[PDB]
Every structure is written in structure tokens, then in C-alpha cells.
């Protein structure tokens, strides 16, 4: 699988040795090239995963993530074109290195064949993002933003490490294939429930879980524009991809003690969606809506119904995209006005009509309107939950109450309505914003026509 | 500022028959009523000490509010109607004229030439209109939301641009 | 009760300044200078066909407007769906399902000609 790994490793000499003017022209022109190279990984067998080597392998679950990450990397490049034009060239090369290194650690992480190799490359991603969030951030609190990020993720990461080595000494291998074939029932002993607690709370923290979610509002809001998309789009989803992987040996204790988490997600998803409708900062909305959708997929894995694993993958990519346009859009209002208050800028179609067109179709994508894979994945979660419990619908049905209650709400107060006559700052839309808008939303309608590949391994 | 009987009963008489015409619909009925409220309104325009003048006024508002047509008639173009703020969707500021594309700038040359001299008289008269306004401004800033005129020679009436360059009420 | 002279000249100075704005806002007689476009020749022949305004010529042109509307917004569309279902979709079994028609006594099936059992006598109701 070094088809994709090495050219990204080499991309660091590429950007570092590139000339003064190109750099970003260089950075994109080859990151797109790597994207179609990673588009090859769409070749799955039925159920036997693509085992490329002893340490690297991929399956129907990992591959959609790989294409998401690799194709994402050009997007923050062009997204960061505006924000970081003033800075000198050397840090420009360093910033791209952080982006490439981040995507580098992502692709190996999703493709590791040994659990600890996944873990070492799991939390290896906070190191570059901590640099991105803290150094290149904009507002003052960004200092405390990074601390909240790493400490939250680490507070659960270390228990996983102690658990992982324990399984190594107990079973003899943490490799996905061996642990899957030699999967054994995790008994109900108090020792084993804490083992389950160790192997789950790590992903739950950066899931996030209701109550264990403060980092995203304190990080995504003050993260740099490029950094903000990457966190929500994919760096949310390491825990998820790990979660469906480690859940092969935690049975049957999962069906017995997932209730507190199924609780905290269900109430949290309504709670997060409701508070999402009542923030004064637009950037907090995509952050709070993100966890609301993200709280949904934790429900999927807990019931571990085949249908639940169906929508877990689809919603992951769907939301992972969905947060991307909104953060891109929410960015576009910011630097134009140097504020993230939706109240300050209202009715932008009277000034930016094309931006509004992109705004609404991303919004209705967040609405989970079929045939978009946002709904079908999200819908499969509903069906699995009903199989788990018929009553489940009402609490989550309350989530199909708040989403559109806010997901069109900023539309009618950011892109829709009248304009304040004092902001002459608002200007025409540079084609970059619409162009990246095109590569952002056009895919989601494209693979909508063909949902089986991003459906997941349960096909 | 504060409202006095004259300002307030003129406010009263506006709404009162707005309910009455909406109550009667047909002109002639409301016609006889509207002109008899007029006599009913002047039937006491000689009252003694202002306490009664206020107290009878209190009786006027209460019977007005429960005599207020629950579904009154509102002209659409005015606040509360169908055409209220209807054309704000077509409302667009004047600074979008500046960022016009040069190829498109040469497709409307005369109109961009006129905006050039319109923004020209904006700039050459802005500084004189404001400096005169501050010197004639009483201490403590403005004491009311008033505006001094171009009272002197060769000047523009201060703070005129936006209200002169206000978008037309039918931007269509 | 009483426009102060201050605000009297304010309105009037505001009035004709905005009136002069609209006076300067008129669409110019020059408008619009348009660089050359592309004028297709078949539509040139088609519009030139009906300039004289005879009732038959105008009807034929709108009939041709309907005609090309048939060929490539109706007639080509029925072609490519016809090619789609009975040649590709029905090439796949059970894609197109058909309820058997309500075959009725006295009728003959095209192959066997069997007269589906002729209806027996009636209890003879009439009004």
C-alpha cells in the first residue's frame, strides 16, 4: 500500500524545496495527484480485506476514510490561501508540512494492521494539530484551546495503552486479523468491565460524548480555518474507525453496559442540537451540530447492529464532509468581517448570491435529505435503533426536530434576509471560495448515486 | 420625547377609525360614525384641571383597546402589511458599483462616470460638511437626532450621502 | 406645531440632491454598448421567414418551434427511454411487471382462442 504512503512522505521535500511563488501551486497540484492515487483503494473484495503487507492493510471500512483524508489535503491548502498569504515563505513551507504530516499520520493510522501500530499513529496526530491550533490560531483563548484538546484526548488514550499491552500479554497478538479470528467473549468480571472501560473511553472522549465534549467548542471555534475543518472532518473519526475494530472482542459486555453511553448520546444529541440552535457564534453551531451527528454514530456502534454499522460509515463521511463546507463557508464570512457573529452579517445573497447557493445546498445536506448518503446512513441508524428498541425513535425523532430548526436558521440570518447598510467590506466572491465549494459539495451528490462503496464493510 | 395630549389623541384618532372603517367596511356607515366620533371627540374639548383631562384620557385608551378592531386593516406597503419590507430583497447598496468589473465597467460607462462625480462631490464636500457640523455642534455632542443644514455658502447639508443615496423604495 | 428653518432647508437640500441622484440615475441613451455577439444563420433564415407577418407564416414558425420542441425535448426523449426499458431493463427479469388484464367471458385468448366460460343466466333484474 506504499503506493500512497511514500508520495506523501516525499511531499515534505517537495514543499520545502519548492520555489517562493509556487509552493501552494506546487502543494495542490500534487496533492490532487495523490488523491486519485488513493482513489485506487476503492478496490475491495467481498469480506477479505486488502492485506498489502505484514503491517499495512485496508478494508471496506478504512478505504472511504483514506480517500476522504487524501482528497481533503488539497482543500485546506486552497482554504488557507487567503488566511496565510501575508506570512513569510519559510513558515509557509512549515505550515504545509504540518498539513502533509497530519494527513501522513492519518493514512497510516487508518491502515495499520497491528492495534498498537494504530495506537502509536492514532494519537500521533495531536502533535501536528496542537501546532496548528495553537501557533496559527487567531483569537486569544487559542492558548487554552490546545491544552483542552490534547489533555482530553490523552486522558483516555493512556488507559487504552495499558489495556492494549495487557491483551498482547494475554492473547499473544493485537493484530486485527488474529484478534478477529481468535476473538473470545469478554466476561462480566469487574476486571473485565474495567478492561472494557479502558478500551472504549479512549475513543469516547474524542467521539465526543455528552459531557466529554468541551474541547470541540473551545478548539474548532478558535482553530485556524484549515485546522478547524480537518479536526471535524476526519480527526473526529479515528475513534470511530478504531471503535468498530476493537468491538470484536468486547462482546458480550457491550450489550450489557453500553446503556450509560447510549443514554448520554441520546439525551446529548437532543441537548447538543438544542443548544446549537441557541449560540451567538456561527462557528460554534457547526461544532455543536457536529457532535450531534457524531453522538448518533456512537449509538450505531453500541447496538453493533449490521444496519447500525451501515450508517456509521456513511454518516461519518457525510458529516465529515458536512462540517467541511460549513466551516469553509463560516470562514468566508469571517475574514470579510473579522468576526464570527451571525447577527453581524445577515442576508448575504443580496451581496453574494452564489455563496448563498452553496450555503443552502450544504445546509440541506446537513438536513439529511434523500437520496443524499447523509440520510440513508443516518436512516439506517434509526432502523437499527428501532430493532434495539422501538421507543428509541422519539428521542432521536426529537433530533429530526432541532437540526433543521437550526440548520436553516443561520441561512435566514446569514445568507437570507436583508443587509446592514454599514458593511462596505463585503465584496465579490473570489473564485477560490466557490471553487473549493465545488470540490466540497459536488462529491457528496456524486457518490450519493452509488452508496455501496461508502456504505461500509457490511455489504 | 414625551407625549402630550395633542400628540396622543391624534395617535388615538388614527387607530380608532382604522378599526371603525375595518369594522364597517362599507364607506357610508363608517362615514356617519367617523364624523360623529369627531363630534364625540370635541364634545369635551374644554375640560378642567389636567387631572380629569388625563383621567378621561385613560378611559379613552381602555375602551379604544377593547374597541380596537382585533383584525384591523393595515396597508401592505406600511409596517404590518403584505408589502411591508417586501422590496428589501431587491434592496442593494451603492458600493457594489465600485467593484464592477472593468469589462463590465466599460459596458455602463456613462452611469459609472456619473457615479464618479457623485462620489466626487461626496468626498470634496464630506470634510467641509462635517467640520462645520462639529463646530456648530453644541457641547456634549448632539442634544437630539437633528441635522444642521448647508446654511453657509458652497457646502452640502451635513450627513447627506446615505440619505441622498438611499436605495429607491421600489428597487425592482 | 412647525418645521424649523434648520430642518426646512435640510429636507429641501436633501430633496433635490436625491432628485438629482435619480436625475443622474437615468439609464443613459447610449445604454447598452454591447460588443458583437454570435448570430446564428438558421434562426436568421427562420425569423426572416415570418417577418412579413402572414397568418400562415406565423403559424408555421410556431409550428416549427413546436416541431423542434418535439424532436429533441419530446421525440428524442421517448427514443432513449424506449431504448432503455424494453431493451435493457426488460432484458433484466422482473424489472417491468404487468398485471394480467381482466379477461372477460366471451373473449378469446390470442393463442388458444379459448372462449373464457360464457356467462350463465341472470336473475333478471330490470327497471
Amino acid at each position: 500500500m506504499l503506493k500512497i504512503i511514500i508520495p506523501t512522505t516525499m511531499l515534505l521535500p517537495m514543499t520545502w524545496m519548492s520555489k517562493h511563488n509556487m509552493i501552494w501551486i506546487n502543494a495542490t497540484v500534487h496533492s490532487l495527484l495523490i488523491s486519485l492515487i488513493s482513489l485506487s483503494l476503492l478496490n475491495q473484495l467481498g469480506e477479505n480485506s486488502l492485506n498489502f503487507s505484514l503491517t499495512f492493510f485496508s478494508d471496506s471500512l478504512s478505504a472511504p476514510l483514506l480517500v476522504l483524508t487524501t482528497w481533503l489535503l488539497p482543500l485546506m491548502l486552497m482554504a488557507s490561501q487567503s488566511h496565510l498569504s501575508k506570512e513569510t515563505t519559510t513558515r509557509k513551507k512549515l505550515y504545509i508540512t504540518m498539513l502533509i504530516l497530519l494527513q501522513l499520520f492519518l493514512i497510516m493510522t487508518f491502515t495499520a494492521t497491528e492495534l498498537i501500530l494504530f495506537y502509536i499513529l492514532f494519537e500521533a496526530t495531536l502533535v501536528p494539530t496542537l501546532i496548528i491550533i495553537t501557533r496559527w490560531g487567531n483569537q486569544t483563548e487559542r492558548l487554552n484551546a490546545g491544552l483542552y484538546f490534547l489533555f482530553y484526548t490523552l486522558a483516555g488514550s493512556l488507559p487504552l495503552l495499558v489495556a492494549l499491552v495487557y491483551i498482547q500479554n494475554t492473547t499473544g497478538s493485537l493484530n486485527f486479523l488474529i484478534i478477529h479470528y481468535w476473538s473470545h467473549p469478554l466476561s462480566n468480571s469487574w476486571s473485565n468491565i474495567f478492561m472494557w472501560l479502558a478500551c472504549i473511553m479512549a475513543f469516547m472522549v474524542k467521539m465526543p460524548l455528552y459531557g466529554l465534549h468541551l474541547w470541540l467548542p473551545k478548539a474548532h471555534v478558535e482553530a485556524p480555518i484549515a485546522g478547524s475543518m480537518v479536526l471535524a472532518a476526519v480527526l473526529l473519526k479515528l475513534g470511530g474507525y478504531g471503535m468498530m475494530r476493537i468491538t470484536t472482542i468486547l462482546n458480550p459486555l457491550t450489550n450489557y453496559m453500553a446503556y450509560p453511553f447510549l443514554m448520554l448520546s441520546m439525551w446529548g444529541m437532543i441537548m447538543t442540537s438544542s443548544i446549537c440552535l441557541r449560540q451567538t457564534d456561527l462557528k460554534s453551531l457547526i461544532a455543536y451540530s457536529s457532535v450531534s451527528h457524531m453522538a448518533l454514530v456512537i449509538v450505531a456502534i453500541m447496538i453493533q447492529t449490521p444496519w447500525s454499522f451501515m450508517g456509521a460509515t456513511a454518516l461519518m463521511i457525510a458529516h465529515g464532509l458536512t462540517s467541511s463546507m460549513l466551516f469553509c463557508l463560516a470562514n468566508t464570512n469571517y475574514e470579510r468581517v473579522h468576526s464570527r457573529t451571525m447577527i453581524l452579517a445577515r442576508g448575504l445573497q443580496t451581496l453574494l448570491p452564489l455563496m448563498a447557493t452553496w450555503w443552502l445546498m450544504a445546509s440541506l445536506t446537513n438536513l439529511a435529505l434523500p437520496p443524499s448518503i447523509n440520510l440513508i446512513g443516518e436512516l439506517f441508524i434509526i432502523t437499527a435503533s428501532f430493532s434495539w428498541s422501538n421507543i428509541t425513535i422519539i428521542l432521536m425523532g426529537m433530533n429530526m426536530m432541532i437540526t433543521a430548526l437550526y440548520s436553516l436558521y443561520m441561512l435566514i440570518t446569514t445568507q437570507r434576509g436583508k443587509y446592514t447598510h454599514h458593511i462596505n467590506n463585503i465584496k465579490a466572491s473570489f473564485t477560490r471560495e466557490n471553487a473549493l465549494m465545488a470540490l466540497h459539495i459536488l462529491p457528496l451528490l456524486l457518490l450519493t448515486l452509488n452508496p455501496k462503496m461508502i456504505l461500509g464493510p457490511l455489504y | 420625547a414625551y407625549l402630550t395630549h395633542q400628540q396622543k389623541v391624534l395617535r388615538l384618532y388614527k387607530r380608532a377609525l382604522r378599526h371603525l372603517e375595518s369594522w364597517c367596511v362599507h364607506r357610508d356607515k363608517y362615514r356617519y360614525f367617523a364624523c360623529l366620533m369627531r363630534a364625540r371627540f370635541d364634545e369635551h374639548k374644554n375640560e378642567k384641571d389636567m387631572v380629569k383631562a388625563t383621567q378621561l384620557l385613560r378611559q379613552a385608551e381602555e375602551e379604544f383597546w377593547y374597541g380596537q378592531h382585533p383584525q384591523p386593516y393595515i396597508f401592505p406597503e406600511s409596517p404590518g402589511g403584505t408589502s411591508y419590507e417586501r422590496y428589501e430583497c431587491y434592496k442593494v447598496p451603492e458600493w457594489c458599483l465600485d467593484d464592477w468589473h472593468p469589462s463590465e465597467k466599460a459596458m455602463y460607462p456613462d452611469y459609472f462616470a456619473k457615479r464618479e462625480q457623485w462620489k466626487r462631490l461626496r468626498r470634496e464636500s464630506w470634510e467641509r460638511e462635517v467640520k462645520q457640523l462639529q463646530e456648530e455642534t453644541p457641547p456634549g455632542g448632539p442634544r437630539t437626532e437633528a441635522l444642521p443644514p448647508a446654511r453657509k455658502e458652497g457646502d452640502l447639508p451635513p450627513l447627506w450621502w446615505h440619505i441622498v443615496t438611499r436605495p429607491r423604495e421600489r428597487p425592482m | 406645531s412647525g418645521y424649523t428653518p434648520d430642518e426646512k432647508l435640510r429636507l429641501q437640500q436633501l430633496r433635490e440632491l436625491r432628485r438629482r441622484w435619480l436625475k443622474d440615475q437615468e439609464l443613459s441613451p447610449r445604454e447598452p454598448v454591447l460588443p458583437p455577439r454570435r448570430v446564428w444563420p438558421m434562426e436568421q433564415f427562420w425569423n426572416k421567414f415570418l417577418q412579413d407577418g402572414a397568418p400562415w407564416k406565423n403559424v408555421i414558425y410556431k409550428t416549427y418551434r413546436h416541431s423542434i420542441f418535439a424532436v429533441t425535448h419530446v421525440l428524442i426523449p421517448v427514443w432513449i427511454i424506449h431504448y432503455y426499458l424494453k431493451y435493457h431493463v426488460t432484458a433484466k427479469p422482473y424489472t417491468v411487471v404487468e398485471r394480467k388484464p381482466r379477461i372477460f367471458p366471451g373473449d378469446t385468448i390470442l393463442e388458444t382462442g379459448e372462449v373464457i366460460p360464457l356467462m350463465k343466466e341472470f336473475p333478471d333484474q330490470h327497471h
Binding site: - | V92, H101, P167, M172 | -
Partner: peptide, 12 residues
């Protein structure tokens, strides 16, 4: 007589 209607710059 016909007045002028202003729009956002569109060519971009």
C-alpha cells in the same frame, strides 16, 4: 423613462 437597477458584481 427608465431608471438604473444596481446588482452585485456578477462576472466573477
Amino acid at each position: 423613462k427608465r431608471l438604473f437597477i444596481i446588482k452585485p458584481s456578477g462576472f466573477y
